[PDB]
């Protein structure tokens, strides 16, 4: 992790210089070594997740309670306007509303209905700042967890059938991009632990 005072001054069209080429291989070999290690570590991590994530299978049609989770439906609302959350998709889409929402004295989104583009856009237009979505964390199921709390499956785009193994799909999704991450601090900066 040491930057050079004299950077490369030529394009691969123009053709590097011999010294420049030597300096380039420095980083490239290091990157290759890092990838070989990152793949190994990612495989290990995936095994740990999938083993710890087992035994979580959907074994009930509908939850027993009503307690939900508070999520920010819209954020960074500039002055005189309402702006939806930047990364709303990963968070609140495909989630089950624990209870109905009334903003003008009329129900807008009915309960136990998944949320897509149209419904979220409507709620944002109405101007509600937050939302209460059902989720596994507050789920109260005598056996495992219920289908409603986990909400619709992303892959099938439909409500999760009973008996689906959610743990293994969770582990696989978490583990797959580990090889793709390949992120590291560019330079220690000459300081350790900062």
């Amino acid at each position: 992790n040491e930057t050079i005072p004299r950077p490369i001054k030529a394009s691969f069209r123009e053709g590097l210089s011999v010294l420049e080429y030597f300096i380039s291989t420095h980083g490239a070999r290091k990157g290759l070594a890092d990838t070989a290690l990152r793949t190994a570590d990612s495989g290990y991590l995936t095994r740990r997740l999938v083993d710890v994530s087992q035994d979580v299978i959907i074994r009930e049609e509908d939850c027993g309670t009503e307690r939900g989770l508070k999520l920010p439906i819209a954020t960074r609302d500039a002055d005189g306007t309402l702006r939806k959350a930047e990364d709303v998709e990963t968070s609140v889409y495909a989630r089950m509303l624990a209870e109905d929402v009334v903003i003008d004295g009329k129900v807008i989104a009915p309960a136990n209905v998944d949320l897509g583009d149209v419904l979220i856009d409507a709620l944002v237009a109405h101007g509600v700042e937050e939302v209460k979505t059902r989720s596994i964390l507050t789920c109260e199921s005598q056996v495992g967890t219920c289908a409603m709390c986990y909400g619709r499956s992303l892959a099938t785009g439909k409500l999760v059938d009973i008996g689906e193994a959610v743990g293994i799909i969770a582990a696989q999704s978490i583990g797959e991009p580990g090889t793709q991450l390949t992120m590291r601090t560019f330079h220690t900066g000459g300081v350790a632990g900062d």
Binding site: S153, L154, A155, T156, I169, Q172, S173, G175
Partner: protein, 290 residues
């Protein structure tokens, strides 16, 4: 004290007595599981457990010999120490100091050593097993195929479908009897290939790549004969496997039972997995050229 309470209560609630700490009669592995299988060339193949058992029984014999006659305390005590060393090496070789290196090039295997780790029993021969009715080959790109079609080479197909092609050949009277059918398929006549072309359709095959990061590794497809010696594959699904075409061998399996092929047609079919399970977006629409 808290740690001790745990163990004593565990002993007390269990009906078994603690005296099992001191085993007296050492079991022995059944002979087959530790085979002294004959090897061509006058040589022999032996599992190290045979050597460990030889060591322990030999030392027990010598201790019996000493105890029979009047012997000093030093020698009998050393002998009992030796017996304890042999037994411990049998259960665990290398749990204390240098292991019993046996031939000297490497340590000797032990029972516990067999049940542990990457090469152990559990993680290599109970959660992953080799399987009959499978194959492997390089995979090449064939555009004209449909989303449900993959091109199996001829030889791989015929080897894969030997019971079925044989059954149809005898049923169609192309072969006289079963032995004649086997000889016929081994010979490889055009009639065999035609029967095969008849039997493969409407029978799923699971294509599958090696890393299998996420559930889009295993994908069912309809078979379809094609010349050459390489699997063909539908270019849209390639990015689900993360499979490039520099060169990449992809395994093929068969759902043998009726229930298995029902699962292949309904669940693992290649036309019902457009969306990557991670975040709910299209994944089966690659982008390199089209």
């Amino acid at each position: 004290a808290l740690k001790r309470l745990k163990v004593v209560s565990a002993f007390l609630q269990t009906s078994n007595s603690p005296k099992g700490m001191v085993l007296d009669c050492v079991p022995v592995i059944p002979p087959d599981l530790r085979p002294m299988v004959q090897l061509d060339g006058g040589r022999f193949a032996t599992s190290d457990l045979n050597d460990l058992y030889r060591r322990v029984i030999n030392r027990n014999n010598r201790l019996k010999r000493l105890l029979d006659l009047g012997a000093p305390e030093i020698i009998v005590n050393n002998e009992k120490r030796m017996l304890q060393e042999a037994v411990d090496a049998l259960f665990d070789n290398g749990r204390r100091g240098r292991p019993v290196t046996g031939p000297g090039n490497r340590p000797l295997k032990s029972l516990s050593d067999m049940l542990k780790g990457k090469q152990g029993r559990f993680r290599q021969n109970l959660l992953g097993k080799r399987v009959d009715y499978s194959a492997r080959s390089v995979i090449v790109v064939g555009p004209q195929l449909k989303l449900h079609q993959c091109g199996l080479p001829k030889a791989m197909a015929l080897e894969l479908f030997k019971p079925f092609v044989m059954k149809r050949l005898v049923d169609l009277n192309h072969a006289q009897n079963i032995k004649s059918a086997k000889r016929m398929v081994e010979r490889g006549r055009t009639v065999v290939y035609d029967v095969l072309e008849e039997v493969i359709a409407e029978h799923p095959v699971l294509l599958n790549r090696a890393p299998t990061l996420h559930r889009l590794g295993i994908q069912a497809f309809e078979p379809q004969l094609v010349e050459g010696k390489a699997i063909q594959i539908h270019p849209l699904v390639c990015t689900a496997f993360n499979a490039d075409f520099d060169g990449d061998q992809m395994a093929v399996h068969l759902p043998l039972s009726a229930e298995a092929q029902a699962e292949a047609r309904i669940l693992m079919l290649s036309s019902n997995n457009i969306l990557k399970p991670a975040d709910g977006r299209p994944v089966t629409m690659p982008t390199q050229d089209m």
